[PDB]
Design a protein around this ligand. Structure first.
Ligand SMILES: O=C(O)C(=O)Cc1ccc(O)cc1
Ligand SMILES: O=C(O)C(=O)Cc1ccc(O)cc1
Ligand SMILES: O=C(O)[C@H](O)Cc1ccc(O)cc1
Ligand SMILES: O=C(O)[C@H](O)Cc1ccc(O)cc1
Ligand SMILES: [Ca+2]
Ligand SMILES: [Ca+2]
Ligand SMILES: [Ca+2]
Ligand SMILES: [Ca+2]
Ligand SMILES: [Ca+2]
Ligand SMILES: [Ca+2]
Ligand SMILES: [Ca+2]
Ligand SMILES: [Ca+2]
Ligand SMILES: [Ca+2]
Ligand SMILES: [Fe+3]
Ligand SMILES: [Fe+3]
Lengths: 332, 332
């Protein structure tokens, strides 16, 4: 009936603002406060954080509009969907705060004659803020299970796409005096990681180099690569694709890190045959987004069928619970 | 249950993409082809509009993910929620294509520390694009009803926030002997109005001037102002507020258009006391967006209470269906 349609459309409209508020509420500290305390006071929160209170009221209202919170007086309370939304909060951030400009510009991005040069913008800073927690909450457990079953003690580890440095820091903690090499394409990340490494006492163990897995052989730290016996690479596998570029990069990595014994490669992958009305969280946004950026996403099976050609043998594999279909390969 | 919360949060995620896809689908022709024919061929559609098909498949998938269309092989077919979504497409467009940058930047915008200068940004062309259908779809019935019941035939009409100039062209169509007079703030919104009026052939009838109602005493082509016997102002009244400013701006219009007989004033207002889970479409976005923008938004009762002090007398009032709580006042 028409009343059902009004309601469902209104919900779509309001989910939009709830969606954008989920990641905002996270960044601003609201969700955390709500998880500990079950309850908060809007004004008191606004004063403490020094936020424009009429906008704060809207934020929670947006969240309340779809049952993530409940409002009673000037009090906001966790609602029936608080845990699900909060569990997945960094995905909403990725979607909105990170990638909001891409989806906004849909009528501009879809036309073929616009799809040349740099044809879309995203907030690089926002993306790395969400990708941090995305790595931690979704990929880490499997990353550690892979490390748990290496069958040897690494002496030198390289991490492709090292971001903030935290993965190499945790590795140094696991294996006290291991050396670390982080490869990152971004100068901001490098400086940040050098600072954070230094901050935690590892300046002497962990160093960073500017670069891309895809041109890893042109990198001037190349002579340090012979020492590396563990290789890691999370959340950028798909950017090695198309398939023939992937084969090339994998071979380049094989040759440049000849003494690597295990290479842990983690990423999300493209799903097949999920029906339109049962699509889980993230999946459509991840997939639709990369199609909008004209970036191909392999499936699990496509990864499976590229390793040997790329010069690697896959010896273990771990599914992620649950971020579309995501996986950690162990290669050798 | 845990399964229900999973499904709900996924729908909130997917509704974000669907929401954005509604305004995109409209701008790109898909909603119109769908409403005409009930179905379309995604490949043909992609070909006809020269669009990147995989991203087009993404848009229709977003829209299907929440019941707006159904995908059937290569065909997209209207869904149960289509009539309602299509009806409000310009509201979704406003939220996303128009105002997406505001809501995206929620964590940068809410902190008082960053609320100086030009601290948010929206897509002015996208906004005016939607606002043309908002006007025509939600305000026109009332607007023409008001005009049908004036008790006089206007000789010269002044439209504040003339936008495209389309309001004035219709007036001209209706009253061939009439003198149009657009007053917009944008020197280049004038331009595409002037050349467009001209291009359709109303150039001796409708002329245009830069100006802002709020500072209407300071305008530089007042030649025609004493001749204006009908004044219109749509979708911008709330910009006159807070109250004292509104009193002043109303007085200033009174003194500047001293032979105006009726002043038609149309706007959306702030609702009161609607339960968080029964919010209808648009309301939260209008209200939350303006709070985020630092823009005062009056209730129906606040408007009611201000006109006499503003030097006007409210003789008629029209409810709109249903753009939240929207109204058209007739003042003399
Ligand atoms: O932003 C992009 O292009 C990404 O691909 C980020 C990404 C990669 C893998 C994930 O599991 C989640 C996010
Ligand atoms: O974008 C804004 O600030 C608006 O105020 C637009 C607007 C104003 C009134 C309406 O009834 C619908 C949209
Ligand atoms: O083909 C695959 O399944 C993966 O690429 C990695 C893999 C392959 C074979 C195994 O026995 C375990 C893991
Ligand atoms: O006070 C109001 O409701 C409005 O200002 C307009 C109005 C006021 C009195 C009337 O008799 C009819 C309309
Ligand atoms: Ca409290
Ligand atoms: Ca509950
Ligand atoms: Ca951006
Ligand atoms: Ca396989
Ligand atoms: Ca067809
Ligand atoms: Ca913008
Ligand atoms: Ca006439
Ligand atoms: Ca006052
Ligand atoms: Ca409704
Ligand atoms: Fe990517
Ligand atoms: Fe406004």
């Amino acid at each position: 009936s028409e009343a059902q349609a009004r309601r469902a459309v209104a919900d779509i409209f309001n989910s939009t603002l709830a969606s954008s508020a989920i990641g905002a509420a996270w960044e601003l500290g609201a969700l955390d406060e709500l998880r500990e305390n079950g309850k908060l006071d809007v004004s008191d929160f606004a004063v403490r954080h020094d936020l424009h209170e009429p906008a704060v009221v809207g934020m929670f209202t947006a969240l309340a509009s779809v049952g993530i919170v409940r409002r009673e007086g000037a009090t906001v309370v966790v609602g029936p969907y608080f845990d699900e939304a909060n569990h997945h909060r960094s995905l909403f951030h990725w979607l909105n705060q990170g990638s909001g400009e891409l989806f906004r510009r849909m009528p501009q991005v879809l036309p073929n004659e616009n799809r040349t040069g740099k044809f879309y913008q995203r907030d690089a800073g926002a993306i790395s803020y969400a990708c941090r927690e995305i790595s931690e909450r979704y990929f880490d457990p499997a990353f550690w299970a892979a490390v748990d079953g290496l069958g040897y003690t690494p002496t030198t580890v390289a991490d492709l796409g090292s971001g903030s440095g935290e993965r190499l820091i945790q590795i140094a903690r696991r294996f006290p005096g291991v050396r670390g090499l982080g490869v990152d394409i971004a100068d901001g990340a490098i400086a940040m990681a050098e600072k954070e490494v230094a901050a935690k006492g590892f300046g002497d163990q962990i160093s960073f180099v500017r670069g891309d897995a895809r041109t890893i052989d042109q990198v001037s730290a190349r002579g340090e690569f012979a020492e590396v016996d563990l290789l890691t690479c999370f959340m950028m596998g798909h950017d090695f694709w198309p398939r023939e570029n992937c084969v090339q990069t994998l071979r380049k990595l094989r040759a440049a890190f000849p003494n690597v014994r295990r290479f842990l490669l983690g990423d999300a992958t493209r799903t097949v045959g999920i029906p339109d009305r049962e699509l889980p969280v993230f999946t459509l946004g991840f997939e639709f987004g990369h199609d909008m950026m004209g970036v191909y996403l392999p499936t699990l099976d496509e990864w499976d069928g590229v390793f040997e050609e790329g010069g690697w043998r896959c010896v273990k594999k771990h599914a992620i619970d649950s971020l579309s279909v995501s996986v950690v390969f162990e290669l050798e």
